[PDB]
Symmetry: D3
Subunit: 234 residues, 6 copies
């Protein structure tokens, strides 16, 4: 571990991963006796208790290259189950801000990180663990939360322009866009890790007029985190 500087036995087997260190710390308060195991390079990691089960909440930063490093090092420290909990922008009009999307697969443009790991340009199925995903669905529905199940496009260029973005990716079967799922899923399949993803809808690209308040999004993040933690400790 060059970036995450935790010690032997500090990182839990099951980890809730988020991109924003602010969210990691915030969610750490849902744990019992949470301990900061790492803060190097801003990647905050907390290990505490949830439902009497030891788990960790880790920061993975933005982008495939970043989350790949974090996952590799966390696994080197004992982690083998990862559930990414993040924010996304819907690509379909019917989804509201504050609702969730349980990811079933990730579309991505070839090259870069994937070529280095896969060694060629084959489109390897980028999917989460079947079982873990169904467990998330039960957990969310059990908590009466509004979620949608579908694929997402994992973009590498947040600001790159594309006048046909929404139609293009929505017509391709994706209902939302974020940036780490493809990497998380593919690397996991290749390394043998059990992974899944649930995203909180913070924006709707198919409706640049709707908005959620700050207090209403943090409540959405908190309610979902509980559902994810129920799953990580089930």
């Amino acid at each position: 571990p060059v970036h995450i500087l935790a010690k032997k036995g500090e990182v839990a087997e099951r980890v809730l991963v988020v991109g924003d260190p602010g969210r990691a710390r915030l969610l750490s308060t849902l744990l019992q006796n949470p301990k900061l195991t790492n803060e190097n390079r801003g990647f905050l990691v907390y290990t505490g208790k949830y439902n009497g089960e030891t788990v960790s909440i880790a920061t993975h930063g933005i982008g495939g290259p970043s989350i790949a490093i974090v996952l590799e090092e966390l696994a080197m420290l004992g982690a083998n189950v990862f559930i990414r909990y993040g924010t996304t922008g819907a690509l379909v009009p019917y989804i509201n801000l504050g609702e969730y999307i349980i990811v079933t697969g990730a579309s991505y443009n070839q090259g870069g990180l994937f070529y280095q790991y896969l060694r060629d340009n084959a489109c390897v199925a980028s999917t989460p663990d079947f079982e873990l995903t169904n467990k998330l669905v039960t957990s969310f529905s059990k908590r009466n939360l509004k979620y949608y199940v579908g694929n997402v496009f994992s973009s590498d260029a947040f600001y790159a322009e594309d006048e046909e973005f929404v139609k293009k990716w929505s017509s391709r079967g994706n209902i939302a866009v974020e940036m780490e799922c493809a990497t998380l899923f593919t690397l996991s399949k290749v390394k043998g890790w059990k992974s899944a993803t649930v995203l909180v809808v913070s924006d709707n690209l198919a409706k640049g007029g709707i908005w959620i308040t700050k207090e209403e999004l943090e409540k959405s993040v908190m309610d979902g985190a509980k559902a994810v933690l129920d799953t990580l400790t089930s």
Copy 2:
């Protein structure tokens, strides 16, 4: 109008079980009530009957992405919108036994041709089946006490192309079996708005020597799986 599948509108059901071998289509039609052959053009046998109070069609798709794409497109033009592929496959992992089943959760594939023509560029669009439908398949195979494994498959386009590290390469990429039509089915269904899924009967294990099964042991496996699929399609 369709130029390969010459069935008339109203002769193809909304729910379709698709298989590659026209012989399997004929053999499975016996599971339907009052089965009627609605097409035989170009050898693409399509039967339409009932099952569980639902009208269902069993259609032949031939071998390969190009062939299945054509059949799916035409069936859809004839009103089909729910497809469940029931095929045969070679396992890529040691622990999966012959005659057992694989419920597909995704398909790996090499870019090019068909995908480029439909998608218009070389993006790796997630090639996955309908979530709801796939879980129902699981439920039906479980309710009928059948041994299944859930995982991704590699949809190859060249059955006989040589590749020395084939099995290890694709199994290390998270695929547990290999066949040739899933990527096309999933991706095209995604683009066209169709609900699709797939279950495969393991007829070979590329990871474990050359173990075998009696011809009858295999037919039973195919028959048992067909019933579970038909239950799903009509659930």
Copy 3:
């Protein structure tokens, strides 16, 4: 051994006329002396008889590169080494009339899948038929006073994929017609050392409205062309 074409060794001739429609294979077998069905597995009808004192087989290859690749591979394993594809096609240029023929000199294609698996990279390997064999086809069609055009074709993998400038794009690239198996046939024959060629019956013109021909006018066209191909195969 072959797992799709279940003909036994000695049941498939060295010279094979291959067609995509199993119905055409049956219909053309009548041109052979003492035609015998040597396979029907998976609908791939293969007939073997004589013509001009030569033993010849007529085999079904289904639709698409993946399908024809499998059939060619297995027929070859059964001793075949000379293949002449006789199919149907859509002209990309205005001046070619329905029922007329196109003797293929090359095939354009989109890289990917099958080609990548066989070639191992994305090189554009010249996809051309055997020179000697193609000239003989020309000679036979000329000797039988049939109207043919000689030129390249685009071997598409997605029959229904949308492309607004399709006809102009491919015709401006030097292709006079479009079908789906030539690139695979030519390239694979090149790699495997087989002698292959192809003649196509024009059943549609994508460049000129929607002119048509009687069903019988078409069958005659197919029959007349089959005779010329059989003459070539046995010359």
Copy 4:
């Protein structure tokens, strides 16, 4: 900007960017009257004065996707001159630890980010601003620092295995490897920004290793930072 929440007027036109939030905090002590203008998502940004000019030190995280986001938002807040200061692994045996590499270009594997921005697979020259780079050579020369000028490979997969890694990239004209330069240079050429990069060698992939010290590196990092600030304010 949704990531860097600095107020307009809180980010300088001249920006020194580093991947580690920790390094940004440490280097802010080199500015006069340093103010923290952003803390969101861990992307610490400091603004202050140096040699009579307003300057900012910003965190870009790891990988092309992350730095692209940060550069775009800093640019939207007024930044137009960027100088990345990072760590790297040398690909040639003669470069010692603690020394510096002034980058003249970046090799990269075609990938999603470049495709989304460039709209095709063209290998656009990924180079820094010529003038700015020479000013860097001048500043590092004036401070008597040991540096080498050359191309670097901007990798997207820190942990991807490659049996011939060193031989391959060194034979392609690269003397070091890192992860954000290609993105920085290419994005800057497309956006019209002036950019450059200096790297501190913290490891040598071509040599068994060198005997240095956590404090020899500290000084090396600080010394270089002064050279960059001089350049940014030249």
Copy 5:
């Protein structure tokens, strides 16, 4: 015409194209009352008479980019029929030095020039005109010359190393390697020009031990040129 500076009516409709200006001048002596119409940038072009038929012999230099420019300009000057006459290296052991190969198609690596003309990476059939090629075969056989008919690989890198070169390209259906055929054929199909190619075997890559004398190769070049000219004026 920026490179070939001929005037209206100087370039013939039918042109024999060779890569070496030395060969163009040498072959010009087979014509009657040959006139040098251009020598700009070394691209020597001669227009004379053969069998009472007006024809031209033009220099196209080495490589796809070079021959593409020459063909484009020659066509702009009235040319529409081109028969490339050059040298090649056999990829099969059974062909001797001084014999000829009548090209039926050309294999090539995608990209560069082809992407600019074709606008994407489709593998367009790169073949010569069917009729013209058969005419060459009759002409050579008529002159009792030893030729082979087959495809060739049009390489862009004469010195690029490839330890499996011969097996790779020979197993792909090519019997020889040169550098302009793919360009000649594809551009011709796209521009509507009638083209063909005959190559003189100057080397056998599948036998790095055989050699031909200088007087024996020039006789091979002269004998073949006559056969090609018979065809261009038939």
Copy 6:
């Protein structure tokens, strides 16, 4: 070498390369006691002295494939420092005819030549030698010549149509277009040669046109050549 038939010891380590054989002949008059060491295939090579150093002026023809062959053979004959001096079309409105462009990098479309040499599709940084390029800036400055420093697009298809040519390449950080730089730079990085390039602007693709004269260009070409020779002998 099978193309450049110069005798070993007849080619200098320092070489000024130009595409036009005619320009090579014209510039040889700048050397002391110029000797023609190669005439084969039109690739005129002259060797002589200048500022107390042996120097060669060689012809490379048009396109990457041609220059690659010439560079490889000159290198086999002892050349290791190359400076290309060519003509170019500006992609930005502010550059006037007769002025110069000192190239800092080359954009290119992935193609056969790069694939054969690099063995894959990696976008290796195609840059000139940093030192050599600065020496060029110095020599052109000392001779009071008007130049601009920037990247160029190395095209393979002079006549390929592209409705948005200028906008596309200028927006990608390129200020001019030519055809051999990418090959020169990349091959040199892989082979260990020291290379650079200066271009004379003979046309401006972004502006209707400028009123110059065949003799203003002659002088521009001669003046630049002296600046390059000074650099090569610096």
